[PDB]
Copies of this chain bind each other. A is one copy, B any other.
């Protein structure tokens, strides 16, 4: 598992960050509650930078997608990024 994805996995699951970034109730997507605060408060802890645009670009390079209503916060998803599915994470690729 690439270091970016190992860090992403850890930071999403970390209870200490859940007020800003956490798994959905079933773990098939993850929620960033406040993008500005996430970039200033969580990203330095895990990546030693605070650049949301770089982070989102990296998610895009790995094929992550956004979850939106059929009809600031953001919800991301990847078929192979699922809480508890440690071996499936190996399928997330650039």
Interface of A toward B, CB cutoff 8 Å: 24-26, 28-29, 56, 59-60, 64-71, 75-77, 79-80, 82, 85, 88
Candidates B59, B70, B80; contact of A66 at CB < 8 Å:
B70
Number of copies: 2
Question: Do B65 and A28 touch (CB < 8 A)?
Answer: no
Question: Do A70 and B65 touch (CB < 8 A)?
Answer: yes
Question: Do B67 and A67 touch (CB < 8 A)?
Answer: yes
Collect the chain B residues with CB atoms within 8 Å of residue A66's CB: 67-70
Candidates B59, B65, B82; contact of A67 at CB < 8 Å:
B65
Closest to A70 in B: B60
Closest to A74 in B: B70
Question: Do B82 and A28 touch (CB < 8 A)?
Answer: yes
Question: Do B82 and A71 touch (CB < 8 A)?
Answer: no
Question: Do B77 and A67 touch (CB < 8 A)?
Answer: yes
